[PDB]
């Protein structure tokens, strides 16, 4: 959790209003914050964390004001140095006829990562989706965390 609100500006979802009010129990009222969410589409389940969560993230595909349209890509997570954003490495095959073997090649792609996803840990394969320019670098948003404790080289548990 950690107090979100943290900054100096009051974090809130736009046009989702309040009004607490008098009388007893709650008190005001118990949830104290109406929350608005939506499913991205493309059959990406909007994870519970999004609905359950307090966090604000405009950039979030479920909780925020961003639409996912365009290319849907998958990549492996190389970095999770930056707050709320990750870098994924995309391997692809380059074909060279002139004589014919193509050589592995890669590209790194910066992509925003909603706090709804966690355990975003380097090594994880992830499915990101195209989006409106979030930041000068970031074109994408993490839609699904593919996972696996597998890759055994260790034993994951639950």
């Amino acid at each position: 959790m950690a107090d979100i609100q943290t900054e100096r500006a009051y974090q809130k979802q736009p046009t989702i209003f309040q009004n607490k009010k008098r009388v007893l129990l709650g008190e005001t009222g118990k949830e104290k914050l109406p929350r608005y969410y939506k499913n991205i589409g493309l059959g990406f389940k909007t994870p519970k964390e999004a609905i359950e969560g307090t966090y604000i993230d405009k950039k979030c595909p479920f909780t925020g004001n961003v639409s996912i349209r365009g290319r849907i890509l998958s990549g492996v997570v190389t970095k999770m140095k930056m707050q709320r954003t990750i870098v994924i490495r995309r391997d692809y095959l380059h074909y060279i006829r002139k004589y014919n073997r193509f050589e592995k090649r890669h590209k790194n792609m910066s992509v925003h990562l909603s706090p709804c996803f966690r355990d975003v840990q380097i090594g994880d394969i992830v499915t990101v989706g195209e989006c409106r320019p979030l930041s000068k670098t970031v074109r994408f948003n993490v839609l699904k965390v593919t996972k696996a404790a597998g890759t055994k080289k260790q034993f994951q548990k639950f």
Binding site: Q5, Y10, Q18, K20, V23
Partner: protein
């Protein structure tokens, strides 16, 4: 002049982008209104695609709405108290979106007393006897007491807002973009936001 284009600076690779074409009007951009509080002045600006955008420089009244009330009143904007972006904005008393201002309350008070007939805070007897009392006294027998009776329950109003009423100045957050729109509008703070700003207002103050 000013040039939204990235095509200066450096990419992510870090390589020196080489100059392609000049600075192009399509990329065009501008100086800020830096709108300031006081007797109204506005200027028209030519924007892309025809279309005219108001640049407000100096504003004294805005249209601020009391959300929980569901009512909006036009008041003088007294001053700038808090600004997340930059402090100068506050000290200079410059108007921008997200700026936290103090409006004036009197229009809100006049409406509230009239509609609920319970007067805010615990002001005074002499005041009641004077004007606003006349409204309170009202009557029609009849006319209005029945309405006042119907109301009650809400009418609690929230401690933080009422306390502010005593001052005669209410905290509000500028919703609109004065430099763009030419209107300095906003909503009275409240609930949680009001709690956060009060914490900021006292905390930093001293």
């Amino acid at each position: 002049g000013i040039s939204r284009d990235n095509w200066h600076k450096r990419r992510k690779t870090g390589g020196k982008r080489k100059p392609y074409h000049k600075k192009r009007k399509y990329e065009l951009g501008r100086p800020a209104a830096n709108t300031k509080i006081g007797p109204r002045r506005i200027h028209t600006v030519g924007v892309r695609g025809g279309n005219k955008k108001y640049r407000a420089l100096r504003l004294d009244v805005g249209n601020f709405s009391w959300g929980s009330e569901c009512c909006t009143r036009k008041t003088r904007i007294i001053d700038v108290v808090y600004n997340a972006s930059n402090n100068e904005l506050v000290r200079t008393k410059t108007l921008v979106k997200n700026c936290i201002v103090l409006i004036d309350s009197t229009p809100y008070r006049q409406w509230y007393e009239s509609h609920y007939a319970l007067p805010l805070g615990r002001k005074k007897g002499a005041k009641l006897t004077p004007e606003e009392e006349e409204i309170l006294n009202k009557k029609r027998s009849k006319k209005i007491q029945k309405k006042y009776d119907e109301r009650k329950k809400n009418a609690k109003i929230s401690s933080l807002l009422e306390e502010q009423f005593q001052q005669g100045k209410l905290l509000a957050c500028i919703a609109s973009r004065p430099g763009q729109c030419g209107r300095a509008d906003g909503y009275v703070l409240e609930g949680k936001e009001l709690e956060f700003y009060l914490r900021k207002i006292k905390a930093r103050k001293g």
